[PDB]
Amino acid sequence: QQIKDPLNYEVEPFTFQNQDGKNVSLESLKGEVWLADFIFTNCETICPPMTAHMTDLQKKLKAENIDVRIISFSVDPENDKPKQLKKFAANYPLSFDNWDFLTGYSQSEIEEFALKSFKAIVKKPEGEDQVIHQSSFYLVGPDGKVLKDYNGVENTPYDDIISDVKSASTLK
Ligand SMILES: [Ca+2]
Ligand SMILES: [Ca+2]
Ligand SMILES: [Ca+2]
Ligand SMILES: [Ca+2]
Ligand SMILES: [Ca+2]
Ligand SMILES: [Ca+2]
Ligand SMILES: [Ca+2]
Ligand SMILES: [Ca+2]
């Protein structure tokens, strides 16, 4: 199975901090397939579904014994410190074993990283957000190129994403 019309976007170099305060870099992800999304922690009124979907994705990949990493980038890094990241994650039955939630950057940095790497327009919350616009899941290959995007908000094609993770792993 060969991966379709790959997006081939180049993820910019980065070093951010995870929920345990540990450095995570693009370089550190070299040779690994991974999945990426964009989240914020501060929502009383309806929280977006992305982390819930990603949680069920994480479970499905664990069940097929698939080597993958998961990265969630914060889009409100001023509020989302490593402790807030932990407390958010606590609302979900997810494992940190192959998932990092990242912060340690300004709003400007992440906005520009997201536009260059993923062609995504991210923004701060207005204290709330159902979802404003799409939000997508991205598949990144072992050499740091974005290969595919998927809808993380509704009707996530879990089986397609799993099949693409397996194919992106090939020949290594
Ligand atoms: Ca790097
Ligand atoms: Ca940095
Ligand atoms: Ca940093
Ligand atoms: Ca190096
Ligand atoms: Ca669920
Ligand atoms: Ca791995
Ligand atoms: Ca905020
Ligand atoms: Ca669903």
Curated annotation (Swiss-Prot):
Single GO MF descriptor: metal ion binding
Predominant location: membrane
Membrane topology of the entry: Lipid-anchor
Keyword Protein biosynthesis in annotation: no
Record-annotated Thioredoxin domain positions: 5-170
Gene3D superfamilies tied to this protein: Glutaredoxin
InterPro entries for this protein: SCO1/SenC, Thioredoxin-like_sf, Thioredoxin_domain
Binding site for Cu cation: 43, 47, 133
Classification via SUPFAM superfamilies: Thioredoxin-like (SSF52833)
Keyword entries, A-Z: Cell membrane, Chaperone, Copper, Lipoprotein, Membrane, Metal-binding, Palmitate, Signal
GO cellular-component term (any): plasma membrane
Locations listed in the record: Cell membrane
Record's function text: Necessary for insertion of copper into the active site of cytochrome c oxidase. May play a role in copper homeostasis or redox signaling.
Assembly and oligomerization: Monomer.
Family: Belongs to the SCO1/2 family.
Annotated protein name in UniProt: SCO1 protein homolog
Organism: Bacillus subtilis (strain 168)
